[PDB]
Amino acid sequence: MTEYKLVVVGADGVGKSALTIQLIQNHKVDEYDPTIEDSYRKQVVIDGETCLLDILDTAGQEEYSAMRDQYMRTGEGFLCVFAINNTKSFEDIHHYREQIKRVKDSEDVPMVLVGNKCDLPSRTVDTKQAQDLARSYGIPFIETSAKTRQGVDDAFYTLVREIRKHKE
């Protein structure tokens, strides 16, 4: 079965793990397991054909992570996540995008900008500012809530579409 490797990056605390687990848990009966894995698989249908997503969550750059760059280089597409009530995590998006280009040795890498925690009323990053940043990068932008499930499936599906566009 075809397998696409998706890597989730961004500052710690923005909801990288919550988004990933919410995607995996949606639409299925999951074993109760309190383990937090750093990677999860999910079956999807791409152009009528069942495929596997392998989704890996990475540590924010404020944490040392010996394998982080090697892990990222295996990624075919990246979810760059910030929290809408965390201005620094949005400012950090530039770092993550440049670090993705570094580890992939490429100027053209599939990515999606994700503004998470959109259930919160304490936003400090205007939706327009993130929309305009994504457009300037040529990438999609979506606001999500791992809490309410708003946009969660759609964020990962949009990334899969970006990967497919790149492959073609």
Ligand X SMILES: Nc1nc2c(ncn2[C@@H]2O[C@H](COP(=O)(O)OP(=O)(O)O)[C@@H](O)[C@H]2O)c(=O)[nH]1
Residue 136 DSSP one-character state: H
Q: Which does 73 bind (CB under 5 to 8 A by kind): ligand X, Mg ion, none?
A: none
Residue 150 DSSP one-character state: T
Closest CA relative to residue 4, chosen from 50, 63, 48:
50
Q: Considering the complex, what minimum distance in angstroms separates the CB of residue 19 from ligand X? A: 7
| Interaction between residue 120 and ligand X (CB under 6 A) | yes
Helix (H) or strand (E) holding 143: strand 141-143
Q: Footprint of Mg ion on residues 135-154 (CB under 5 A)?
A: none
CB of 13 or CB of 88, closer to ligand X:
13
CB of 112 or CB of 146, closer to ligand X:
146
What is the per-residue burial (b if ≥16 Cβ within 10 Å, else e) of 37-50? eeebebeeeeeeee
Q: Footprint of ligand X on residues 18-77 (CB under 6 A)?
A: 18
Helix (H, G, I), strand (E, B) or coil at 38: coil
Q: Considering the complex, what minimum distance in angstroms separates the CB of residue 80 from Mg ion? A: 16
Q: Considering the complex, what minimum distance in angstroms separates the CB of residue 55 from ligand X? A: 12
Q: Considering the complex, what minimum distance in angstroms separates the CB of residue 89 from Mg ion? A: 12
